[PDB]
Design a binder for this molecule. Sequence first.
Ligand SMILES: Cc1cc2nc3c(=O)[nH]c(=O)nc-3n(C[C@H](O)[C@H](O)[C@H](O)COP(=O)(O)OP(=O)(O)OC[C@H]3O[C@@H](n4cnc5c(N)ncnc54)[C@H](O)[C@@H]3O)c2cc1C
Ligand SMILES: NC(=O)c1ccc[n+]([C@@H]2O[C@H](COP(=O)([O-])OP(=O)(O)OC[C@H]3O[C@@H](n4cnc5c(N)ncnc54)[C@H](OP(=O)(O)O)[C@@H]3O)[C@@H](O)[C@H]2O)c1
Length: 511
Amino acid sequence: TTHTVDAVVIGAGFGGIYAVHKLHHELGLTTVGFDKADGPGGTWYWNRYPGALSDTESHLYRFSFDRDLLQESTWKTTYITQPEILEYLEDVVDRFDLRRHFKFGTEVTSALYLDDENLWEVTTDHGEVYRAKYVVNAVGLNFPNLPGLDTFEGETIHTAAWPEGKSLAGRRVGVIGTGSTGQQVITSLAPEVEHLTVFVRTPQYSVPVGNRPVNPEQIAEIKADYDRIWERAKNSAVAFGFEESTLPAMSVSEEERNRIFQEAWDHGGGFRFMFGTFGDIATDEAANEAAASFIRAKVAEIIEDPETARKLMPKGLFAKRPLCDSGYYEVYNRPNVEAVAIKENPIREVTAKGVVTEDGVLHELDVLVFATGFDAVDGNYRRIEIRGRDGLHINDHWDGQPTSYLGVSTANFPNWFMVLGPNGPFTNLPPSIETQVEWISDTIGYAERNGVRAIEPTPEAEAEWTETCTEIANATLFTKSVLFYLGGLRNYRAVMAEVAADGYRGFEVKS
Ligand SMILES: Cc1cc2nc3c(=O)[nH]c(=O)nc-3n(C[C@H](O)[C@H](O)[C@H](O)COP(=O)(O)OP(=O)(O)OC[C@H]3O[C@@H](n4cnc5c(N)ncnc54)[C@H](O)[C@@H]3O)c2cc1C
Ligand SMILES: NC(=O)c1ccc[n+]([C@@H]2O[C@H](COP(=O)([O-])OP(=O)(O)OC[C@H]3O[C@@H](n4cnc5c(N)ncnc54)[C@H](OP(=O)(O)O)[C@@H]3O)[C@@H](O)[C@H]2O)c1
């Protein structure tokens, strides 16, 4: 059974929800949405592990496009939890009636271009087939081979498939992984579990998030100033709601530096620490080191036991998405929390009763939690039968690193777009999702008005875009993995407006 539509939107997180709203309400296109999830919410649908929390502040982790909605939504704390965000995204879907454009619990399994007809032939896992003029892919994004893993008699849980309402209260838990998800899950588990063992491979740099109850209504004061808030964020590099400093770290005294660091520490927020204090933490070695040493002193001060402190001490460049936490380091002071540094004491095997390390101790567990991420990020592209012009498979097109033109498109796949594809901005992401979806929507409307049959980037333009992302990246310390565009949102937005205004420079446009 075969349906013919104007647009397919794959995914129902922030990106897919807005794409469907744009393509249907603005453009008047027959548009169908899909998601494996049973509901909208995307990453916030799947991720229900304890202590799930935004690193963007509450008032800015949301859409900006609707003024009334912005005046309507509420929240409890300065930062927003998974249940609050998910119910927000459910409210967005209800607000604009997008529910009836979505097929939930429905996986897209093939998207094939039809060269002679100029259409995409897209099929689900219930064998329905959609013939579409445009595809918008807002698809978003790992089990450590551990010997004897399935010998384990307790529960094994990955962070990304946390069984609904499962509590670990009163259990013996092991946590493997100390990324953003690891730290949250660890801070949240420490108070409730009978015992907790963390297996840390790379300890990370992390600052206080400063997640505070919000004042009766000084939600009101932000709501009264929302147009300015969003205009500023749109006109900044990372759109996290503070002035991004230009002040070189090493051009003030030791005591001013410490003072400025301390005030960011106490206010909290990860990007604020990296980009709100000074302007060169990411591009100058001594500045980076200075921010690095500050955090390490914090760690040395907070963790009382010298040996525990040592295992948790972050080292090297403070040059990965700045982490922020709700008392992560302090957790290691509790008598039922234990850290194992697996670089120096590797995991030997898992057995019925728990994890055995190379020192030959059995860490008896009831539950093993993997906060170990997913294998790949481009996997929602690589796992689908996606074929563009001349039957060229996406995996063969991206025979190396995945590429894009402008973060939203790629050679050989006409009328096929990406929300947060490779080589795109690195930012508080909803305002970048909006930028991309707005532009993709503008583009699709343009094609409709102008009897365009196919639009796709040139290999030159795409390759020039990669060179552009690689130049900007090489100026930063984040080099020394995937290539973001690191010019910031303002720059990115100008790049996008310019391309559209200059009549889609870099794109081949068949009519
Ligand atoms: C715990 C956590 C906290 C985060 N907090 C922040 C934050 O504070 N600030 C920030 O800027 N970013 C944050 N992020 C990143 C987050 O990914 C983005 O902010 C944004 O929510 C992603 O939206 P999305 O629409 O691009 O992708 P997603 O939300 O991942 O949605 C993609 C959808 O694609 C679906 N899908 C994939 N393939 C198929 C297919 N073949 N068929 C059907 N459906 C498919 C998936 O099921 C998923 O529902 C966080 C991420 C995590 C994991
Ligand atoms: N969308 C994008 O463009 C983009 C770009 C970059 C990153 N991301 C990531 O998406 C992630 C969400 O997932 P997450 O935080 O749960 O995972 P994560 O950031 O990949 O971190 C996984 C943690 O588990 C550890 N780990 C991984 N494999 C291990 C193993 N085999 N044995 C022991 N430890 C292991 C890692 O340690 P090590 O540090 O030693 O490996 C790390 O501490 C974000 O954290 C974000 O960084 C997205």
